[PDB]
Design a binder for this molecule. Structure first.
Ligand SMILES: *[C@@H]1O[C@H](CO)[C@@H](O)[C@H](O)[C@H]1O
Ligand SMILES: *[C@@H]1O[C@H](CO)[C@@H](O)[C@H](O)[C@H]1O
Ligand SMILES: *[C@@H]1O[C@H](CO)[C@@H](O)[C@H](O)[C@H]1O
Ligand SMILES: *[C@@H]1O[C@H](CO)[C@@H](O)[C@H](O)[C@H]1O
Ligand SMILES: *[C@H]1C[C@](C)(N)C(O)(O)[C@H](C)O1
Ligand SMILES: *[C@H]1C[C@](C)(N)C(O)(O)[C@H](C)O1
Ligand SMILES: *[C@H]1C[C@](C)(N)C(O)(O)[C@H](C)O1
Ligand SMILES: *[C@H]1C[C@](C)(N)C(O)(O)[C@H](C)O1
Lengths: 7, 7, 7, 7
């Protein structure tokens, strides 16, 4: 990761 | 809000 | 984004 | 003010 979310 | 990110 | 805030 | 925006 490294991005965020939430999915 | 309620979503996340990060932008 | 493009909106503002703050939430 | 105190809120943000932008309008
Ligand atoms: C990103 O979100 C995860 C899940 O809640 C968390 O473990 C990290 O601390 C946070 O930075
Ligand atoms: C973003 O939201 C996640 C999930 O609740 C949390 O773990 C992080 O600390 C927050 O920055
Ligand atoms: C939020 O956006 C306004 C408008 O561009 C800027 O003046 C602020 O510094 C920023 O926090
Ligand atoms: C809020 O946005 C205004 C307009 O750009 C700015 O003057 C403030 O510095 C900022 O905090
Ligand atoms: C992150 C926040 C969210 C998008 N509202 C969710 O609860 O649906 C997701 C599972 O976690
Ligand atoms: C959230 C995580 C990210 C997408 N990697 C970023 O660091 O670019 C952003 C500023 O914050
Ligand atoms: C932006 C301005 C605000 C709406 N007054 C707040 O302080 O509550 C928020 C956290 O940030
Ligand atoms: C703040 C950002 C915005 C909502 N995109 C706008 O450019 O329309 C407004 C004038 O300023």
């Amino acid at each position: 990761x490294x991005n965020x979310x939430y999915x």
